[PDB]
Amino acid sequence: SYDMNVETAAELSAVNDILASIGEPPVSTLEGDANADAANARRILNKINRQIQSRGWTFNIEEGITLLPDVYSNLIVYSDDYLSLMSTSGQSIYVNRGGYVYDRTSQSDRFDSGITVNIIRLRDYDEMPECFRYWIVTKASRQFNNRFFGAPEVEGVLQEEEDEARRLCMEYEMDYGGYNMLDGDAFTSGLLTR
Amino acid sequence: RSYDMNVETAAELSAVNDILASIGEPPVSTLEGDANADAANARRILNKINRQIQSRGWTFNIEEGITLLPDVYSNLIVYSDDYLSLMSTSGQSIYVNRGGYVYDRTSQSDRFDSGITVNIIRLRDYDEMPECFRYWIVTKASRQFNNRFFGAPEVEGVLQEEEDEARRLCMEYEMDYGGYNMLDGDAFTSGLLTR
Amino acid sequence: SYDMNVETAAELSAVNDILASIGEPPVSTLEGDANADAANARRILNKINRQIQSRGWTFNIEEGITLLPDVYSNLIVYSDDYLSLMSTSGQSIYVNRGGYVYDRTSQSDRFDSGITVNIIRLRDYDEMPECFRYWIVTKASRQFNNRFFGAPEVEGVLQEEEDEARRLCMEYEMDYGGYNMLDGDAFTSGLLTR
């Protein structure tokens, strides 16, 4: 259940801003001193990054990919990287069992030659658009304010700020998905056929 | 320092860390060596709440008709504490425990051969859970561990808003994952649309 | 009027959680130390288990069983185990008198060859579904919080919590009973005969 044992310059600027949320100064590099101030600020980033991924968003969802079994076992590892696994159409079948995909209708584990699913893959603080990269910080900037320096007046401003941020995030995909009522969907696209 | 450097931890351990971050205090490294109430406190409140989130609802949790098999010699079926809720398939469910064993409350009997067909909610770990719920199992535990122990009203009044937002994301999950249909997939009004 | 002079491991974890409700740390075994903290927590569990049974719920109600008198006496013991005793149809006849069932219409006590009733049998903290096993704890987590460590803020959260627990309990039998308006009842099942 993924570890933060590597470092990145673009991820470093996020940890600075989470430390700004208390009022703490920058940490120059995340190689480490003894401070729980910068250690908790990095974990609350990772703990919230896996929420923002767990939602929603349309670039995050990989429409039908194929997961392939180890031919000799034969099963597919359902890793903690995979945040949410559903099926393509409806009445999704798969769920983990021991860390492995498992049919809850076919009563079976072992199957050959693949599946087609929608995986939300877990990505970094990088591999994210800048709308969300703000909101991953400023949502972390609330729970890091609430767990260590819990001043009610600097949180009550920040709650208004992360809500503003999430709105800009919801502004993003509505454009980015480009979705359509009457011309792009599954049902009422078929009705407009003359 | 290094890259690429892929590595994983216990999801059970990191959940106990987030409970300890929520009350407000430094991360505890390990769980075993049964010292530190805070590691027994946070892990019990995790387990005590994981068995609620399973006790509800959710559709991957419900195993549609499985068979439970008695011994040939006794002949009864053990109804364990692991089985959270046991109902029948259709309606006017018959089964209920009696000494830890399943029991007909209509056939007035305990002993039957050749099995049943039921809906068991099986209890699973903190793992064997999707990530939407793994969040909400923590942040609901982050409230009852805050309430029962760090009894400051302002930290829970924040966190109560947070676990409710978690539950909505959880409620969002199966609505997709079940993919349920009003007029085409159900028991009654699927039959009415037949031409 | 049933005593808690036996012990159970699954019942032990309930007493732990009632002790968590103050903020007190666990008791390992219920064999006993001097503390009234664990002794009052075990009693308030038993005192509330006999309420949740006294309600309602449909697995709890045993539809018509037979109680059988001692052929030589001849009466039926109405024990304190029996929480509520009604008749099958309506205008129920039976009520205790000295600890014994008694007709309040036939003016009599002694009768031969049995009855047919709806007994709510008192069961343990075990022999309960998990929805209720939660709510038997978290209702006990209020009356144990009010009687011994009564901070008003830790009760005010818990009252919201036991209410949410009660709703999950109320959700249970609505499924588990599977009750039907127009196809399963006594009156308007008979109306729909064609």
UniProtKB/Swiss-Prot annotation, chains A, C:
Keyword Zinc: no
Subcellular location: Virion
Record's keyword annotation contains Lyase: no
Pfam families: Tube (PF17212)
Signal peptide: none
Xref: InterPro entries: Tail_Gp11
Gene Ontology process terms (BP): symbiont genome ejection through host cell envelope, short tail mechanism
Keyword terms: Viral genome ejection through host cell envelope, Viral penetration into host cytoplasm, Viral short tail ejection system, Viral tail protein, Viral tail tube protein, Virion, Virus entry into host cell
A cellular component term, taken from the record's GO annotations: virus tail, tube
Family from the record: Belongs to the tail tubular protein gp11 family.
Subunit-structure text: Interacts with head-to-tail connector protein gp8, the tail component gp12, and the fiber protein gp17.
Functional description taken from the UniProt entry: Structural component of the short non-contractile tail. The tail complex is involved in viral genome delivery. Forms the 12-fold symmetric toroidal domain immediately below the connector protein gp8. Once the tail tubular structure is formed, the interface between gp11 and gp12 generates the proper environment to interact with the six fibers, each made of gp17 trimers.
Full protein name: Tail tubular protein gp11
Organism: Escherichia phage T7
From Swiss-Prot, chain B:
Compartment(s) where it occurs, according to its Swiss-Prot or TrEMBL record: Virion
Segments crossing the lipid bilayer: none
Keyword Repeat: no
Originating organism: Escherichia phage T7
Name assigned to this protein: Tail tubular protein gp11
Domain of life of the native organism: Viruses
Subunit-level organization: Interacts with head-to-tail connector protein gp8, the tail component gp12, and the fiber protein gp17.
Any Pfam family matching the protein: Tube
GO CC, any one term: virus tail, tube
Keyword Nucleotide-binding part of the UniProt annotation: no
Described function: Structural component of the short non-contractile tail. The tail complex is involved in viral genome delivery. Forms the 12-fold symmetric toroidal domain immediately below the connector protein gp8. Once the tail tubular structure is formed, the interface between gp11 and gp12 generates the proper environment to interact with the six fibers, each made of gp17 trimers.
UniProt similarity note: Belongs to the tail tubular protein gp11 family.
GO BP annotation list: symbiont genome ejection through host cell envelope, short tail mechanism
Primary location group: virion
Keywords per UniProt: Viral genome ejection through host cell envelope, Viral penetration into host cytoplasm, Viral short tail ejection system, Viral tail protein, Viral tail tube protein, Virion, Virus entry into host cell
